[PDB]
Swiss-Prot record, chain A:
The protein's role, per its UniProt record: Required for normal vault structure. Vaults are multi-subunit structures that may act as scaffolds for proteins involved in signal transduction. Vaults may also play a role in nucleo-cytoplasmic transport. Down-regulates IFNG-mediated STAT1 signaling and subsequent activation of JAK. Down-regulates SRC activity and signaling through MAP kinases.
Cellular compartment(s): Cytoplasm; Nucleus
Protein name according to UniProt: Major vault protein
Subunit structure: The vault ribonucleoprotein particle is a huge (400 A x 670 A) cage structure of 12.9 MDa. It consists of a dimer of half-vaults, with each half-vault comprising 39 identical major vault protein (MVP) chains, PARP4 and one or more vault RNAs (vRNAs). Interacts with TEP1. Interacts with PTEN and activated MAPK1. The phosphorylated protein interacts with the SH2 domains of PTPN11 and SRC. Interacts with APEX1. May interact with ZNF540.
Domain notes: MVP 3 mediates interaction with PTEN.
Portion of the parent chain present: 457 to 507 of 861
Species whose genome carries this gene: Rattus norvegicus
PTM field: Phosphorylated on Tyr residues after EGF stimulation.
UniProt repeat feature MVP, residue ranges: 2-51
């Protein structure tokens, strides 16, 4: 299983492509991806000034 | 659970107070900022009239 341990004040958005349904869980939950569930990888800005 | 809302509350408090302090001392001369040093910095943090 692929399971991500979500931080407390954080949200992870997934979709079950096998089931045609959308769900996003905020808060400190342990997501459990179905065999065709995929994550919302977020490219975020960082660096000293910004990137 | 609202306690853990901000994950870096130490930094949040320091940055907010530093910002407001700097902004308020920005409006006064060096002579004033040293005569009423604690007075203006403490009213800088929570500026109001009560």
């Amino acid at each position: 299983v692929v399971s991500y341990r979500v931080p407390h004040n954080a949200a992870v958005q997934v979709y079950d492509y096998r089931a045609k349904r959308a769900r996003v869980v905020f808060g400190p939950e342990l997501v459990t991806l179905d065999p065709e569930e995929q994550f919302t990888v977020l490219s975020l800005s960082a660096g000293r000034p910004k990137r | 659970a609202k306690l853990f809302s901000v994950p870096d509350f130490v930094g949040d408090a320091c940055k907010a107070i530093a910002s407001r302090v700097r902004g308020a001392v920005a409006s006064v001369t060096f002579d004033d900022f040293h005569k009423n040093s604690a007075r203006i910095i403490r009213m800088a943090v929570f500026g109001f009239e009560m």
